[PDB]
C-alpha cells in the first residue's frame, strides 16, 4: 500500500514508488502493439506514435497501453493496491484531467489517485513553495510562476521548443559540417551526442569567434563503425536555440525572455520572490553552463538592484518525479487523495475538487 508516482512526459515516462529518491522505471513514451523500448527496437515493422504531444495527452488508447506497460511490465505492481499520483502539464484542459481520472479508476481500478502540475512538483523537489520554474523536456518548455503551490494561470508561458527540437537542429548542423544523419538510428545517435558534448556558451558571439580560430572547443564522438565525429561550435550552437529560437525559424523569444515576460505578468509584489527562486527542471535544462547563462540573461533584463538566483539541481532530469515522490509520501497529503468511494459515487468530474 505504497503510493505510485507516474510522471508522463512527451518523450519519457518516469514511474516509481513514492518514497524512493528516483524513479525505478524510465522508458520512451512510445507505442508501436509494443510499448517503450520494445517498440523502439522493432520499429521496422511498426509505426511509432507518441500519445503525449507538447505535454498534452492526445491519444487515449495508446496512453492506456503506456500505463498498462508501466504498472505490469516495468513496475510489476497491482494498481488496485496503490494510491497513484499522476502529473500533468500546466494549463492541461479539464476534459483531459477527467479522462485521466476515469481510466485510473475504471481501467486500472486504483484505490486512490491524484493529479499534480509537473512544474509545481519540481518546485517542491527543491524545497520551495513559491518561485518560478523553467520546465523544459523533450516536447515542450514552460515558464511557471508559482505562489504557495498555486500556478498563476495568467503568467504561465508555453514554448513548443524542447529537446527533440534541439536534436533535429543538431542533426541539421552536423550534416552542414560534413556528416550525414538521416535514418532514425542516426537520430538516436545524434541525440546521444547532444546530451554528451553540448553546452550553453556564456557569450555566444565570442564562443563562435573562439571556435573558428582554434580547436580548443572541439570534442569527438566515435560511432561503432569507426567514424569519429568531431564538433566545435555545433556543441553550443545547438542549445543556443533555447535563447535564440530563430535558429530553427521560430519567432518566439528565448527562454530568458519568456522567464522575464512571465515574471512581468505576475503581481509586482511577487516578482522579487520569483527573481530569487528560478528553479530549472527537465532534461533539456541539463546542458552545462545553462544556469550561468540564465543568471546573466535575467540580470540584463531585470532591475539593476534585483537579486537573481538560478537553482539547477543535479537531479533535475527527474525533478518532477522527485517532487511527486515527496508529495505523495508526506502525511499532510494523505487526506488530499481522491478516493475510489468519491469517484464511485460522484464520477470523473470530482477531480476538480
Amino acid at each position: 500500500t505504497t503510493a505510485l508516482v507516474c510522471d508522463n512526459g512527451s518523450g519519457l515516462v518516469k514511474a516509481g514508488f513514492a518514497g524512493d529518491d528516483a524513479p525505478r522505471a524510465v522508458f520512451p513514451s512510445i507505442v508501436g502493439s509494443y510499448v517503450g523500448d520494445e517498440a523502439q527496437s522493432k520499429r521496422g515493422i511498426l509505426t511509432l506514435k507518441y500519445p503525449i504531444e507538447h505535454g498534452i495527452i492526445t491519444n487515449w488508447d495508446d496512453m492506456e497501453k503506456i500505463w498498462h506497460h508501466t504498472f505490469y511490465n516495468e513496475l510489476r505492481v497491482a494498481p488496485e493496491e496503490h494510491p497513484t499520483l499522476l502529473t500533468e502539464a500546466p494549463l492541461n484542459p479539464k476534459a483531459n484531467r477527467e479522462k485521466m481520472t476515469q481510466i485510473m479508476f475504471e481501467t486500472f481500478n486504483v484505490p486512490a489517485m491524484y493529479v499534480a502540475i509537473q512544474a509545481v512538483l519540481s518546485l517542491y523537489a527543491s524545497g520551495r513553495t513559491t518561485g518560478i520554474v523553467l520546465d523544459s523536456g523533450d516536447g515542450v518548455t514552460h515558464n511557471v510562476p508559482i505562489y504557495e503551490g498555486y500556478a498563476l494561470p495568467h503568467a504561465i508561458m508555453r514554448l513548443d521548443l524542447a529537446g527533440r527540437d534541439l536534436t533535429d537542429y543538431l542533426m541539421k548542423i552536423l550534416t552542414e559540417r560534413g556528416y550525414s544523419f538521416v535514418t532514425t538510428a542516426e537520430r538516436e545517435i545524434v541525440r546521444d551526442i547532444k546530451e554528451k558534448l553540448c553546452y550553453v556558451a556564456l557569450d555566444f558571439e565570442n564562443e563562435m569567434a573562439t571556435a573558428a580560430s582554434s580547436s580548443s572547443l572541439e570534442k569527438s564522438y566515435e560511432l561503432p563503425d569507426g567514424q569519429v565525429i568531431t564538433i566545435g561550435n555545433e556543441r553550443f550552437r545547438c542549445p543556443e536555440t533555447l535563447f535564440q529560437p530563430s535558429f530553427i525559424g521560430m519567432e518566439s523569444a528565448g527562454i530568458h525572455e519568456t522567464t522575464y515576460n512571465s515574471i512581468m505578468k505576475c503581481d509586482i509584489d511577487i516578482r522579487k520572490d520569483l527573481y530569487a527562486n528560478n528553479v530549472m527542471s527537465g532534461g533539456t535544462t541539463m546542458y552545462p553552463g545553462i544556469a550561468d547563462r540564465m543568471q546573466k540573461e535575467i540580470t540584463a533584463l531585470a532591475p539593476s538592484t534585483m537579486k537573481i538566483k538560478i537553482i539547477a539541481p543535479p537531479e533535475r532530469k527527474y525533478s518532477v518525479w522527485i517532487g511527486g515522490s515527496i508529495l505523495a509520501s508526506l502525511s499532510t497529503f494523505q487526506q488530499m487523495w481522491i478516493t475510489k468511494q468519491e469517484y464511485d459515487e460522484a464520477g470523473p468530474s470530482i477531480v476538480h475538487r
Binding site: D20, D21, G127, T129, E148, G149, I326, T332, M336
Partner: peptide, 22 residues
C-alpha cells in the same frame, strides 16, 4: 489549515535527502 501545514511539510521535508536510495 492543512494547506498551510502542507506548505510547512515541503519546507521541512528535507527534499530528496529523506528519500530511500535505489
Amino acid at each position: 489549515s492543512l494547506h498551510s501545514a502542507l506548505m510547512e511539510a515541503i519546507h521541512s521535508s528535507g527534499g530528496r535527502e529523506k528519500l530511500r536510495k535505489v
